[PDB]
Amino acid sequence: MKVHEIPRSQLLKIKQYEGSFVEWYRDLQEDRKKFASLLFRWAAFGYAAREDDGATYISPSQALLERRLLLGDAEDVAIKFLDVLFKGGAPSSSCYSLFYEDFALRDKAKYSGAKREFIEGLATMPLDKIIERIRQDEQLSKIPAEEWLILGAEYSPEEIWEQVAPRIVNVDRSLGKQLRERLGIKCRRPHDAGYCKILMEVVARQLRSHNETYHEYLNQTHEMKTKVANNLTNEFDLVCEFAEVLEEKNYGLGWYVLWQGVKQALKEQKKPTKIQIAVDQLRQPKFAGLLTAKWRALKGAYDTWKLKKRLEKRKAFPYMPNWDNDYQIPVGLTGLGVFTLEVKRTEVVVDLKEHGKLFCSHSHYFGDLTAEKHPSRYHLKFRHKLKLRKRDSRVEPTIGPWIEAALREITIQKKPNGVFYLGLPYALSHGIDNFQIAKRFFSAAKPDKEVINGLPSEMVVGAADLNLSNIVAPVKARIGKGLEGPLHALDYGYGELIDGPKILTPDGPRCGELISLKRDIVEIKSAIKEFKACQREGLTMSEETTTWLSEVESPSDSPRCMIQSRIADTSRRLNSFKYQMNKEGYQDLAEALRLLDAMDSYNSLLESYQRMHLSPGEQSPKEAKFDTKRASFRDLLRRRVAHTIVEYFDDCDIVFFEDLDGPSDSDSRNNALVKLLSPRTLLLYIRQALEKRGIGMVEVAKDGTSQNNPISGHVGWRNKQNKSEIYFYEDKELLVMDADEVGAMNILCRGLNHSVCPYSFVTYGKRVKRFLKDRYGSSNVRFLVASMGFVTVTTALVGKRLYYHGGELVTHDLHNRMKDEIKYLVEKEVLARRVSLSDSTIKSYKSFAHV
């Protein structure tokens, strides 16, 4: 009902409504706001003031003192009510009596089946079984186990229940009624049970969300403080002193600034540098200790200082939440409210008994929808259809497969434009077989034996590489117990390829022009930027820029006029591209990504151009625009990419992906480029789309999955001029391979290996511990260097990278030497040989295999 079901949702537009629906909705929202605000004060939370960006705050003690005045003598009852409501679950399903005026308490506990079977089996149960059964139930725990034994022995179950039922009644079910009579709580409709139930559960949801957020926030602050306090060295003190000195000159620190300043301080300089204040401060005697520090220590000190600066920036408490926006109001079938669903020829009719009827329209998402009524649920059957708004289009209509789901609740919500929407959250049912093998077997370093015994004897698996160009590179294989082949699945057996590595979709013809357009936009931006500077000091623009600007036909020759001619020409081309791609439905995804990049650049060009007249000293801030067209196009592209991958892999069980990193902090130089791929949300969408078809997804370690040889495990050199080719040197021969089919193959190799074989590490964690225990004798070992950089593990080095190439560990230097050897060999234009990874003459894939 909940363990093996997958929830999804979609909306229907409410065309019209009868009865007093709007009054009911408005009353619910107003009471939600009021009582959420009140119960936030009953639970004395600290919070930061919103008006001054959290400079000041209200301590928990002041909130506690104000609560003592607000509640008075009901102080203790409210605390118990709040504890029960915050814990949640079934023991708190009777809190709606805080609002309901006609609430009546039953004086006996419910005769549930779990207690029927307990009482009916008292005769045969020994004392140890009895005490172990009732040590977790708070109702049954009200009676000692020995008394249970005498009751079972001397009395019949029919009279046992009568003797016991009043004794084990839950005494926290009457707390709300105690508060309402004592504080005079009144809601808008105190004689409607469903109204009170819905209101209480919505308010409780909001308060529980804030409770969990608040506690994790207060925990994380202390965690950060302890982590800062555990790392204290001399370099940290020196870096703190250096950072303070720079802030007095309004300069501030950075990793590049510190590193390059230390680099440039040793060498005497003549020409002034971009980082000159830092260099001048670094040449002072009091920072001599920074100039002789080792790189690892300097990096660690910088990291600790960065953590300290982030820690000092946090507020004391989170903001008080804003309750003003509307909530989705849920109504169900066993008590929350009452609704009936009727699918008609042209409408969907939702019947709320005494709050009117809602008439809704049909979707193409819920195509050919039918609903069948069952005792406490609806069975939904529908399909997806193409929406073609053009009446006479040449596209042949398509229809998807059937979908069967279970519906038990509905939601109602109002959009800010004044339209009402009905949400239908349904649940799909699939076997939890594929999702448990992915989480318990393939994500574990050492799976337990009973997991291994339950695995099937055959599997189909896949792997894929995702990039900004040639978006997807997939590979499909089949593994099984008792099979033979090049692929070795750890703890499971062997397997052989089904569909070798390839590139699913190459880039389109229009990708070349969409880069020239962005180059032109950036060049115009530079022209504007230097025109302003030359205007300020009464100089003249350089001849190169004037020659470039004069290439477009213009009605004048002054620079401002030439820059405006260039901007008009550049947007005539962007609009043409947008129109042409929208005409076809955005067939190519790489072209769409390039178009998005060009549009983003053009927006900055316009923003710069609008401020082309400002005078020194005066600032101009950004102006708010209520535009959401870019966010709806960017989202459409991510969903379309997730669909291509899931459509390719529709017959697999497990799919392997590398866990990519999202945009980074200020120290990264290319995080504007990775915001455009935007990888983490793409992975989320891929997981959601695979999960709708009962396919498991695993994320494997990514370091070195683009540098090892899939066949022999040797390192290669990836060309800098062209990133789509990688070169290897084996058997005194030079070989070349595609660097996207190498990534997919290495991802498949690491997935089948549970990511235990490392690419590089420091002289541990579960993966490295298992690798050390299996490849070598034991996990408690030390390392000594030998020969020309090879390492021998013995049962010394500290803090050094060690790489695994070809089955042996090697030191950092030998890895550099091998890559350099390949580089010098290729620089001499030595002809290489093409190797295909889908060859059927390959006898073993040795990449990331330690056994």
Place this chain on the structure above:
RNA sequence: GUGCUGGCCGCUCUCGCUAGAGGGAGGUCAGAGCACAUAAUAUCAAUGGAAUAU
């Protein structure tokens, strides 16, 4: 059902004019295939522009 496109004409703004470029609302003429898990709250990091300094 939700989402994503241009040309042309007035009006109205900001900037410039040896000269035009851009924004907003509206009218009109066209274009239009393939995706869809729906919400509330909180928190962190960056992107772009402008001014300032070595």
Place this chain on the structure above:
DNA sequence: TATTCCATTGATATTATCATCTAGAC
């Protein structure tokens, strides 16, 4: 190279998406 102000975007955590007894009715 750095600082400050605006508005917008990527990402990650919480809260959610009912079942079964009982008392009245008719």
Place this chain on the structure above:
DNA sequence: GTCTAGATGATATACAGTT
């Protein structure tokens, strides 16, 4: 009967270069 509405319901699946 069988409805249909209100008050009450045992505990709990990993790991740490890449775009």
